[PDB]
Amino acid sequence: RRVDDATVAIRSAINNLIVELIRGTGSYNRSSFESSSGLVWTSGPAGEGSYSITTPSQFVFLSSAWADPIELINLCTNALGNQFQTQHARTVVQRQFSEVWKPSPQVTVRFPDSDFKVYRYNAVLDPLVTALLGAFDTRN
Amino acid sequence: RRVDDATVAIRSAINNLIVELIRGTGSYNRSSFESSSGLVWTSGPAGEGSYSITTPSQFVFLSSAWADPIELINLCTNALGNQFQTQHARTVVQRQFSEVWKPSPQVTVRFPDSDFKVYRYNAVLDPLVTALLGAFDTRN
Amino acid sequence: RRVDDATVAIRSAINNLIVELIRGTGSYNRSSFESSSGLVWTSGPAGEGSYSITTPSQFVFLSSAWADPIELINLCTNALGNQFQTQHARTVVQRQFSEVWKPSPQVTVRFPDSDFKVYRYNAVLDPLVTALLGAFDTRN
Amino acid sequence: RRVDDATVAIRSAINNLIVELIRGTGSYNRSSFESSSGLVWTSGPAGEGSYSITTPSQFVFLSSAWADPIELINLCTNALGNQFQTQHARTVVQRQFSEVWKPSPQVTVRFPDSDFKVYRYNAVLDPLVTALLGAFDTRN
Amino acid sequence: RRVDDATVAIRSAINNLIVELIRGTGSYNRSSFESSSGLVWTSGPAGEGSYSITTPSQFVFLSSAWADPIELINLCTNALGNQFQTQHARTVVQRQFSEVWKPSPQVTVRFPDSDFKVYRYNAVLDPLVTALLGAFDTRN
Amino acid sequence: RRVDDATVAIRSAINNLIVELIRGTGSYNRSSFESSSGLVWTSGPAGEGSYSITTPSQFVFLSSAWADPIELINLCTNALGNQFQTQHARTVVQRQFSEVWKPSPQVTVRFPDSDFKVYRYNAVLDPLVTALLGAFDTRN
Amino acid sequence: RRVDDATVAIRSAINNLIVELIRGTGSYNRSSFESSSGLVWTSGPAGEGSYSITTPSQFVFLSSAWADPIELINLCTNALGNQFQTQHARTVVQRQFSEVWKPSPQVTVRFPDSDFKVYRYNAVLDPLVTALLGAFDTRN
Amino acid sequence: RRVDDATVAIRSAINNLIVELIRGTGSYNRSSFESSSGLVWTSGPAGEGSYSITTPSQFVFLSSAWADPIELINLCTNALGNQFQTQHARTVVQRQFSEVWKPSPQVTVRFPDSDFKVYRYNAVLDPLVTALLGAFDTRN
Amino acid sequence: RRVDDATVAIRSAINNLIVELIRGTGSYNRSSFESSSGLVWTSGPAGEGSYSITTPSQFVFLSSAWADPIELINLCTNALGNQFQTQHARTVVQRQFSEVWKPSPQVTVRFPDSDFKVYRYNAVLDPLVTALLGAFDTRN
Amino acid sequence: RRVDDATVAIRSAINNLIVELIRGTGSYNRSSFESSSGLVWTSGPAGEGSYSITTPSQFVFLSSAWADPIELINLCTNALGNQFQTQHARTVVQRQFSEVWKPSPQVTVRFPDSDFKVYRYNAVLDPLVTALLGAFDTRN
Ligand code: HEM
Ligand code: HEM
Ligand code: HEM
Ligand code: HEM
Ligand code: HEM
Ligand code: HEM
Structure with a gap:
């Protein structure tokens, strides 16, 4: 009798995540990432470079918390x-929704120039992804 | 006693999807796709090209979310x-209704010249397809 | 005790479909098909041709949704x-009533010159065929 | 306790069909068939010919829906x-009452010259034959 | 407790059929048959002939519905x-009362010259024979 | 292990009967029947007549031993x-091959004018039909 | 251990029938049918006609022993x-290969004008179809 | 112990079919189809037309025996x-390899203008596909 | 006792595939693909284009038979x-090694300009991938 | 009796890997990596850059096939x-020895400036790591 509730909760979480992914919220390019995270990229000599860390919170932006938007919406579908x-x-x-988040920006690796990425800890997507991952945690 | 309810719900969802597919809603050609998605095709050098992404929402239009109309209505039948x-x-x-949605427009592949495609996340077809896929999720 | 209800419902659906098939409703020749579907046949170079698609709804008319009238009424009998x-x-x-609908008109295949065909999605025959197919969906 | 009801219903349906068959209703020769069905036989070049279909309802007259009167009344007996x-x-x-209806008039085959045939979908015989075929659908 | 009722009903049906057979009702010679059936015998070339059918009801008279009176009354006894x-x-x-009705008059075969025959569908014998055949349809 | 032998014998008997029916042997019209059976038709007064029996062997020709050729070959098929x-x-x-033999010529009923009939006791067809009916007599 | 042999025999019979059907052997049009069967069509008054039967063997040609070539090869495939x-x-x-043989030419129905038909008892196709029908007769 | 042999045979048949499909053998366009089948397309009045059938073997070319090359090689992969x-x-x-063969050329439908099709009964592909379909017929 | 052999065979197939992937064999860029497949890309007006198909074998190059080299070697690892x-x-x-092959070049989609792809049907990689996929087909 | 052999083989493989790791073989810095892989780092505009791929074999160098030396030797210990x-x-x-290999050099990420990495597919370490991963593949 609990499997029905688990299924309904899973479907509701997937639908809410889809609703917010359709609007494009939580997706960042290089400009929006470097603007909202405060990370400034300095291009040292000569082919590499680095981000200047000003507060430790920015470390969250440099973790394994980015997924391709097309891959994520296809996963939802x-x-x-x-x-x-x-x-x-x-x-x-559940494992698929947990492992889709890979790292892209690092301390010595700049955010991609033109691609977009989905932020696992975006203020809107974070509660939806958390509720989605928690909805699968129901066994019999 | 729940299998009867599951059957009735499945049939109702299929009938609603059929009702909206008969009127042709949710079907796009190149013109309607590029108009409603805002994606503009630029013909870079020389025989290829790409879509100009202005907001990340457009990524949903480039996902695996398109089906052939004849294939979809035959699947319903x-x-x-x-x-x-x-x-x-x-x-x-359920697997058939889930796998019928394939990608057709991509970042480097323009929408087909003359064919039509059915949009999985069209404002009208989205709830019907979601409810249909969820109606099969009932076991004994 | 439900097998009796299933039998009665099946017989009633078959009788209603027979009543409407006897009156000839839902049967199309080339003239009525090309008139009600809005599809105009242009005879391109030189021995073939094609239908001019004006709205995507017409794709339903070109799907696997046509049956021979005599074959269908004999199936009912x-x-x-x-x-x-x-x-x-x-x-x-049920499989017989589901598979009897085959394609006849296509984008590059004109409706037969003199034969008649039964339209699965005719406004009158559609609910009858749907209720008939649903009446068989009763198990014990 | 239902086998008695099934037997009585079967016998009643057989008796009603017999009552209407004794009066000769539903029996057609070439003249009455081609007059009441509106099917006109045109003798194309040169030794053959065909019926001219004017409305699709006439297709019912050309299905497998004809039985020999003597054979049918002997089956009842x-x-x-x-x-x-x-x-x-x-x-x-039930299979005997279902298989007794064979085709005789076709698009390229004219109604027999002198014999008589029983019309499965005659306005009077149709409900009786339907109820008879349905009366056998009773299991225990 | 139903076997006694079945036996009594069978005996009553046999007694009623016997009562009407004793009076000789339902027995026809050539004169009475050709008078009551309206069938007129025309002697075509040259040693044979045929009955002239004026209404299709007469076909019932030419079916397998005739029995020898002595054989039938001996069967009852x-x-x-x-x-x-x-x-x-x-x-x-039951099989004996069902198989005793054989054909004798046909479209091209005249009623026997001097013998008498019992008509299965005589207005008086029809309900008695029907009720008799139905009385045996009782199992335990 | 005996059912396989029974199947092979049944198939062989059916094939032999088919082979001899293909050549048309054992099929009679009025001319061949009245010539080979020695029965002479005298047209007594006035529209009827009778066969003149000269030897009792001819009685075999007047028994229930005739079948329609097309019906019999369709039965084999x-x-x-x-x-x-x-x-x-x-x-x-087995019951089908046994019941297909009906009477057609009688003492007071001449062989049909234009039809053909298959003789159950034809010198060639008799052993084949006998072996066929005997091949089915194998149970477990 | 016998099911493997049964399967191999079935496949071999289907392959042999396919091999002979590919070359078209055993397929007849009106010309070849009326030439090889000896049946001559006389166009009696006025839009109909009849075949002139000279030997009873020809009745095999007028039985239920004809199938559409495309339907038969699709059945094999x-x-x-x-x-x-x-x-x-x-x-x-087995039932499908047995029921595919339908009647087309009759005593009062001429061979179709332009279509082709497959003869069940053609000298080459007869043994293949017989062996095919017999190969399915293996149970456990 | 037989499942291993069945698996090896299945893999060998798939590999052989792949070997011949890689070379492109058994694939036809309009030119090669109409050349090797001998079917000549006449453009009757006015926008349609038909193939002129000269021998019955050509009927095999017009059956449900054509598959898309890319779809077939993807199925193999x-x-x-x-x-x-x-x-x-x-x-x-097995069902997938059986259902991939659909009809494309018909009596009144010309071979597609530019597409390619795989012929089920090509002299080289026919035995390979037959052996492939037969290799799956091994149960326990 | 067969699981050990299955494991050893799987490991040997993986090691051989790795040995050939390390050397880079079977990897194509746009130049090598369009050179070895014979497909010539014409850049029609204006942003699209197409490959000119000269033999049907080239269709294998346009199927779902390409994988990213890094993804494939990581899968092996x-x-x-x-x-x-x-x-x-x-x-x-096994499912991972089967599904890693996706389409990249199509009839209307040119091979990527600078990326490399692994050809499923390369003359050297084909037997290794086949043996690898077959090595997993061992159950207990 | 096989668990002892499995233990001995596992220990031997670990000891051999340790023997080769102590000597430092298979460890690369930026100089040795870019020298042995042939990958040349070009510093495109302006703070990023990329490796110049000349043969596809180099892709193995850019896969998930690098481990920290201290982490790997501690894992062995x-x-x-x-x-x-x-x-x-x-x-x-086994999972630990499989997951310790992570990517460090990528197409757009140069080898770390001063750190060292262990190459999974080094000519000496490859067989040892393969045999080690295979030694754990023994169950009871
Ligand atoms: C008992 C649990 C079973 C499960 C969980 C299962 C699962 C599946 C799945 C996932 C598919 C793929 C559907 C698709 O691709 O659209 C499928 C297809 C199929 N299954 Fe099963 N199956 C089961 C039993 C069986 C059995 C025992 C048979 C036959 C004896 C069978 C016959 C088929 C057939 C014929 C198809 C093909 C349907 C098609 O045309 O796509 N299934 N099944
Ligand atoms: C127990 C589960 C069974 C299932 C799910 C099943 C399913 C089917 C299906 C799908 C068809 C095809 C119907 C069509 O295409 O119109 C069919 C036909 C048929 N089956 Fe079965 N079957 C079962 C058992 C049996 C058995 C045990 C027998 C005989 C011993 C049998 C006799 C037949 C026959 C004679 C047909 C041909 C009906 C026709 O003429 O169209 N069935 N069945
Ligand atoms: C137990 C399940 C049985 C089933 C489902 C069954 C089914 C059938 C069917 C479908 C027919 C064809 C009826 C027609 O064509 O009108 C038939 C006929 C027949 N069956 Fe059975 N049968 C069964 C048992 C038996 C047994 C055990 C016997 C004999 C030992 C038997 C003797 C006959 C006979 C004599 C006929 C011929 C009826 C006629 O003349 O039309 N039946 N049966
Ligand atoms: C158990 C189920 C049985 C059934 C369904 C059955 C059925 C039949 C049938 C259909 C007839 C032919 C009736 C007619 O043609 O008028 C008959 C007659 C006969 N049966 Fe049975 N039978 C059964 C058992 C038996 C047994 C076990 C015996 C003997 C040990 C037997 C002895 C006879 C006899 C002597 C006749 C001849 C009746 C006569 O002279 O007309 N029956 N039965
Ligand atoms: C008992 C029968 C089982 C069957 C038939 C089965 C089938 C499958 C299939 C078809 C996949 C997809 C693989 C792919 O897409 O590459 C899969 C993946 C997976 N299964 Fe199972 N499974 C079974 C048992 C289990 C159990 C009991 C668990 C866990 C308790 C499990 C855990 C997983 C995981 C984690 C994956 C993901 C693998 C990946 O990363 O692709 N499986 N399984
Ligand atoms: C019975 C079947 C079991 C299986 C197939 C299994 C499987 C696994 C797997 C795949 C891991 C991950 C190893 C890694 O990430 O490197 C793991 C880790 C672990 N398991 Fe189990 N497990 C089983 C039973 C248990 C039980 C019953 C316990 C404890 C009561 C247990 C305790 C642990 C611990 C403590 C770890 C962490 C090891 C570490 O430090 O990485 N295992 N197991």
Whole structure:
């Protein structure tokens, strides 16, 4: 009797994450990333460079917390077509939603010039992703 | 006693999706796609090209979220003649409705010249397809 | 005790479909098809040709949704003489009513010159066929 | 306790069909068939010919829906002497009443010159034959 | 407790059929047959001939619905001395009362010159024979 | 292990009957029947007549031993496609091959004017039909 | 251990039938049918006509022994992709190969004007179809 | 112990089909199809037309025996990565290799203008596809 | 006792594929792809274009048969650290090695300008990938 | 009796890897990496840059195939003190030896300026690491 509630909660979390991903919120380019994080890129001699860390909070921006937008929305699309009545599908898509966040900007690696990335800890996407990952945590 | 409710819900979702697909809503050609998505095709040197991304929301338009109209309506027709009292048919047609959405427009691939495509995240078709995919998620 | 209700519902749906097929409703020749679908056939160079698509809804007219009238009415006649108390007969005749709809008009294939075809998504036949296919979806 | 009701219903349906067959209703020769169905036989070049279809309803007249009167009344006579308490006899005589309807008039095959035929979808015989075929659909 | 009722009903039906057969009702010679059926015999070239059919109801007169009076009354006499408490006797004598009706007059075969025949569908014998054949349809 | 031998024997008998029916042997019209049977038709007063019996052997020609050629060859065709590993199919097609023989010529009924009939006791067809009917007599 | 042999025999029979159907052998139009069967079509008054029967063997040509070439080769193609290890597939495709033979030429119905038909008892196709129908007759 | 042999045979058949598909053999365009099949396209009045059938062998070319080359080679690629130790995968990929053959050229529908098609009954591909479909027929 | 052999075979196939991937064989850029496949890219007006197909073999080059080299070698690295004694790991890494091949060049989509891709049907990599995918097909 | 052999093989592989890691073989800095891989770093505008790929083999150098030397030798030290008689320890340390290889040089990320990295596919370390990962693949 709890599997139905688990399925409904999973679907609701996926739909809310999809609603916010459609509007594009939580997606950053180089400009928005370096502006909102306060990280300034200095291009030392000659082919490398580095970000100037001013507060430790910026370290969150340099963690494994970025995913490709197309990959993430495709993951949502394919997840909506799963048998969440089963524990196996829940485990698999939970691991998929957890592992999709990879690092892109680092202390010595500048944010990509033209690509966009999805921030795991964006103020709007963070609660949705947290509730989504928590919705799979229901066993029988 | 829940299999009957699952069957009725599945049939209702299929009927609603069919009702909206008959009117052609959610179907895009190159003109309507590039108009509603805001994506402008620039023809870089020389035989290729790319879409100009102005907001990250447009990434949803470039995901795996497009299906052939004839294939989709034939899928609906053939799905309406299944024994949804069985779990096997539910799983199979759920996978069919989930995998019918493939990518067609990409960052370096312009929308097809003359063909039409069905948008998974069209404002009208999105809730119907979501409810349809969720209706199969009922096990015994 | 539900098999009796399933049998009665199946028989009623078959009888209603028969009543509307007898009156000839939902049957199209080349003239009526090209008139009601708005598809105009242009005879391009030189021995072939194509239909001019003006709205995407017309794609439903070009799907696998056409059946021979005599074949369909014979299917109904022979189906009325089945043991629908059994699940096997229900499954078999459901598959028969689902697979009888084949494609005939296409974008590059004109509607047959003299034959008649039954439209799966005719405004009158659509609910009858839907209710018929749903009546077989009852198991024990 | 339902086998008695099934037997009584089967016998009542057979008796009603017999009552209407005794009066000769639903029997057509070439003249009455081609007059009441509106099908006009045109003798194309040179030794053959075809019926001219003016409305699609006429297709019902060209289906597998004709039986020999003597064969049908003999089937009724022999059916009245069966043990309908058994499911096997019900199934067998249901198949017999279903297979007695064969095609005689076709698009390229004219109605027989002198014989008479019984119309499965005659306005009077249709409900009786339908109820008869449905009366056998009772299991225990 | 139902076998006694079945036996009593069978005996009552046999007694009623016997009562009407004793009076000779439902027995026809060539004169009475050709008078009551309206069938007129024309002697075509040269040693044969045929009946002139004026209405299709007459076809019932030419079916397998005729029995020898002596054979039928002997069948009744011997049937009254059976153990109808058993299902076997019921089945056997039901088949005997069903198979006694054979064809004798046909479209191209005139009624026998001097013999008498019993008409299965005589207005008086029809309900009695029907009720008799139906009385055997009782199992335990 | 005996059902395989029974199946092979049944198929061989059906094939032999088919081979001899293809050549048309054992098929009679009025001329060949009245010539080979020695029965002479005298046209007594006035529209009827009778055959003049000269030897009692001719009585075999007047028994229930005639079948329509097309019906018989169709019976063979459909019988070749049965599951004779099962007892049910063997019993059913045995009864079908036994009941197809009906009477046509009688002492007071001349052979049909234009039709053909198959003689059950034709010198060639008799052993084939006998072996066929005997091949089904194998049970477990 | 016998199911493997049954499967191999079924596949071999289907392959041989396909090999001979590819070359078109056993396929007849009106000219070849009326030439090889000896049946001469006389166009009686006025839009109909009849075949002149000279020997009873010709009745085989007028039986239910004709199939559409495209339908038959499609049946073979789809049958080659079945699980013949199962009895169900064997029974079903045996019934399909048995029922594909329908009547087309009759005594009062001339061979179709332009279509082609496959002769069930053609000298080359007869043994292949017989062996095919017999190969399915293996149960456990 | 037989599942290993079945798997090896399946893999060998898939590899052989891939070997011949890589070289492109058995693939036809409009030119090669109309040249090797002998079918000549006449452009009747006015926007349609038809193929002129000169021998019945050409009917094989007009059956459901054509597949897209890219779809077929992708099917082979994905099939090579299955767990053929299981019966389910064997059944599924057998159905996939059986259903990939669809009709494209018809009597009134010319071969596609620019596309290519794979001929199920090409002299080289026919035995390979037959052996492939037959290799899956191994159960326990 | 067969799981050890299965593990050893899997490891040997992975090591051979790794040996050939280290040398870079089977990797193509735009130049090598368009040179070895014979496909010539024409840049029609204005932002799109197409490849000119000269033989059907080239269709293999346009299928879903390309993988990123880094992704493929990382897949090999991670696969070498699995518990192939278990069936689950075998199934998972088999599906991973089967699904890693995606399409990149198409008829209307030119090969990427600067990236490299791994050809599934390269003359050297094809047997190794086939043997690798077949090595996982061993169950207990 | 196989767990002892598995333990001995695991310990031997760890000892061989340790023997080669002590001598420092397979460890690269920026100079040795860019010398042995042939990858030349070009400093595009302005603070970033990229490696110039001349042959596809170099892609192996840019995969997830690098580990910190101290982390790897500490992993070996701590692994030598495990209870490899248990399956759990084998699985865990196998995953540890598989996941220690991470990417460090990328197409747009130059090799670290002063740190050292251990190359998974070094000519000497490759067989040792492969045999080590394979030694854990023994279950009971
Ligand atoms: C018992 C649990 C089973 C599960 C979880 C299962 C799962 C699946 C899945 C995931 C598919 C793919 C559907 C798609 O790609 O759209 C499928 C297809 C299929 N399965 Fe099963 N299956 C089961 C049992 C069976 C069995 C026992 C049979 C046959 C004996 C069977 C027959 C088929 C067939 C014929 C298809 C192909 C349907 C199509 O045309 O796409 N299934 N099944
Ligand atoms: C137990 C589960 C069974 C299932 C799910 C099943 C399913 C099917 C299906 C899907 C068809 C095809 C219907 C069509 O294409 O219109 C069919 C046909 C058929 N089956 Fe079964 N079947 C079962 C058992 C059996 C058995 C055990 C037998 C015989 C011993 C049988 C006899 C037949 C026959 C004779 C047909 C042909 C019906 C026709 O003429 O169209 N079935 N069945
Ligand atoms: C147990 C399940 C059985 C089923 C589902 C079954 C089914 C059928 C069917 C479908 C027919 C064809 C009826 C027609 O074509 O109108 C038939 C006929 C027949 N069956 Fe069975 N049968 C069963 C048992 C048996 C058995 C065990 C026997 C004999 C030992 C038997 C004897 C016959 C006979 C004699 C006929 C011929 C009826 C006629 O003349 O039309 N049946 N049965
Ligand atoms: C158990 C189920 C049985 C059934 C369904 C059955 C069925 C039949 C049928 C259909 C007839 C032919 C009736 C007619 O043509 O008028 C008959 C006659 C007969 N049966 Fe049975 N039978 C059964 C058992 C038996 C047994 C076990 C015996 C003997 C040990 C037996 C002895 C006879 C006899 C002697 C006749 C001849 C009746 C006559 O002279 O007309 N029956 N039965
Ligand atoms: C018992 C039967 C099982 C079957 C038939 C099965 C089937 C599958 C399939 C088809 C995949 C997809 C692999 C891919 O897409 O590459 C998968 C992945 C996976 N399964 Fe299972 N599974 C089973 C048991 C389990 C169990 C019991 C667990 C965990 C308790 C599990 C954990 C996983 C995980 C973590 C993945 C993700 C692998 C990846 O990263 O791609 N599996 N499984
Ligand atoms: C019975 C089957 C079991 C399996 C297949 C299994 C599998 C695994 C796996 C895959 C890891 C990850 C290793 C890594 O990331 O390097 C792990 C770690 C671990 N497991 Fe298990 N486990 C099992 C049972 C248990 C149980 C019952 C316990 C404790 C009661 C346990 C205690 C641990 C611990 C403490 C770790 C952390 C090791 C570390 O420091 O990385 N395991 N196990």
